[model samples]
Target: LGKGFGDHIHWRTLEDGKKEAAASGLPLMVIIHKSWCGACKALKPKFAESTEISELSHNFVMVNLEDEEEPKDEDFSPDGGYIPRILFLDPSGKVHPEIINENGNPSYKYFYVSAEQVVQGMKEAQERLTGDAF
Candidate 1:
């Protein structure tokens, strides 16, 4: 009925998740949200069911920051903070523009991220690593 996370979803704090991604030399993606946010609640189901997420599960690692009760990442910065953000981390656990964030401004566009746009973003990220054509 639902797409299972399989082994790709880490569901940990940002620090441990990034560390694990770094150790495995795999790409990391984080979905940060609060349980009480209406936007987050509304979008989560769609995100869980997105075709791109299912297809890209093995290619990338996912961490659900909502499950992280305590934000303990030493590098977690409060400046320029935004909730319900998607953060992408490189194999080295570093944030790159390609693997960073995109189209996250929900104020104007609402809580919708086009699947096509996400595909393009993923393509861009993949290209940054393997120089593959999106």
Candidate 2:
């Protein structure tokens, strides 16, 4: 890994991230994870070190929703509750339906995802949201 967790990331809460997004006019990347989930724990450090993801993160407001009983956001919590969720919200705090799962749920265990996949997801979100490629 290139660095420790969040070395190049400005991690925030959903509330703070939304505010930042609005102020900066950047997209919001909400990572809803459970501390107790193995996959969540595994993905975090790797995600931070992923070159493409860290670089791409500069364009978005990165939020880490780690608590089981965390802040409530209806749009982020689809199909009840699920662990290891990743969602991209527009600066106005709106979800782009096309970037997420087919079931419209953003949460997934995703234990098999590699750094490249993480980067790919971010790129896809950016392209779809702003018509800009990373």
Candidate 3:
């Protein structure tokens, strides 16, 4: 991930993060991944390398979850669902379930179709939220 993205990425808990996320007025990228899954481990770096995702920069907020760490931050999610789960959320913190869990399969849940999908999702979500695209 880029340095600015690390600084700008917004983390939140499912408990009461909706308020903060809504305040940020940016699309949310929630990564629900466990430590053990090989695919998840492999995809981590790829996600960082994703220009489509990285370009989100200050426009989109990234949220990552880990399994072993003791929850301290407001965004620390104890249960990260399954490995390699990724979601695109609106400022309201409501997820696009169709994109997050296409076909309603455990494997597909939270997985993105492509880097383009990530870019397009963020663009569309932002447009829907602000009624404009820049």
Candidate 4:
């Protein structure tokens, strides 16, 4: 109902994204947020405005979950029930709980507001997915 993450980005349904990730063997970049979240509002444009993210997006399957669309699974909330959590999933459909926000605090793990932080996190996700994170 609200403005989506961006116009240029190919935001996909979670199911479709998972399927594509499985088929392509790419990592899934899943953005979980409530429709009414204020910080999520702040993140929307900054995320979409990133030219780097658009280029990096070609390497992953992207999913944005909002409001009632948010999954009820505990795996989705490895840290807590906080909104605007961004997590990466493997092609095996396993969420990488270790992929928390590098610039954020421990309590609110995946709370990213800046596109710079997101770009860094996505790079980290790519590294982790490729088993090069070590």
Candidate 5:
């Protein structure tokens, strides 16, 4: 939740988000993107308009990279540094490698362009991380 992702989301910094996730026993939803990314621009409106995704935000600690570089940590970037990558991390702060955009290209596992896909990813993360039905 930043810029085009809308200001309504309770977005948190990466560090605080991880901490909150740990404390709350919820998943950390990290969205990596830049302010100038074309695809990121394309996805913003869809992400913002999603009532389901906004509701699902309650299940995790939502984070946004904005123009922030994706963390240099190898675990965070399983593939390349593609804009608008959504990764779900467990409360322990490990990226949930399995919780990816299953409908996306096999090569770009973390990339998501639509809210429905993100909603699916969120549900997947919630179910696996908290055993909660979102």
Candidate 6:
């Protein structure tokens, strides 16, 4: 089991997460991590403790895949395996691989980005989903 991060960030099963995202018309914030990952352990609390992340979290449905296998869908992972991967999906359930890749290169995987980096990613996703001028 992983460390608890209070009530600010809610974790849901993949099925429920997708449903909630669809129903609420909110984005999907999927966290894929292995139980044994050090980076994952470090990132979880950092992400949870962020006030900005907490505020923006209401705009999305969060999914935690700790110690679980990622979906077979390429949309989830275009290049196969990568621990501590964070995927972003639109309200319509479309994966934004472009946003997930920090370098805009699909060849390399961005794993376990720091809490600060993730917050930036969240802001980017929020802007795109809301069409807000950020």
TM-scores of the candidates in the order shown: 0.65, 0.77, 0.60, 0.92, 0.92, 0.81
Q: What lDDT tens digits, residue by residue, belong to model 3 across residues 1-134?
A: 22122333445554345565677676666666666777666665555566766666457556665554323443322234445656566776666554443334455555554555556656655565442232
lDDT of 4 by residue, 40-117 (tens): 988998987889988898788888888888897999988788779999988767898898788988898888979999
Model 1, position 37: C-alpha lDDT score: 73
Residue pairs in steric clash, candidate 2? none
Q: Rate the local accuracy (lDDT) of all candidates.
A: 0.53, 0.66, 0.54, 0.83, 0.85, 0.71
Task: Return the TM-score for candidate 1, rounded to 2 decimals.
Answer: 0.65
For lDDT, candidate 3 versus 4, the one ahead is: 4
- Order of candidate numbers by lDDT, starting with the best: 5, 4, 6, 2, 3, 1
Which predicted model would earn the best lDDT? Answer: 5
Candidate 6: segments with Cα more than 4 A from true spot: 1-6, 101-109, 131-134
- lDDT of candidate 2 over 1-134, digit per residue (tens): 11134756877767787888888878887776776787777877788777788889888888776665355757665545656667777888887644654333234422224576667667777776653222
Single out the weakest 10-residue window by summed lDDT for candidate 1: 1-10
In model 4, the worst 10-residue window by lDDT is 1-10
Candidate 5 accuracy as TM-score = 0.92
Clashes of each: 0, 0, 2, 0, 0, 0
> Where is model 3 more than 4 Å wrong at Cα?
1-19, 68-82, 100-109, 113-117, 129-134
Clashes of 6: 0
Listed per candidate, the RMSD to the true structure in angstroms reads: 5.1, 4.5, 6.0, 2.1, 2.3, 3.2
Per-residue CA lDDT of model 6 for 1-134, tens digit only, reads 22344365777777888888888878888878777877777777787777887887787887777674567677777566766788888877778776664643355455645667777778788888643222
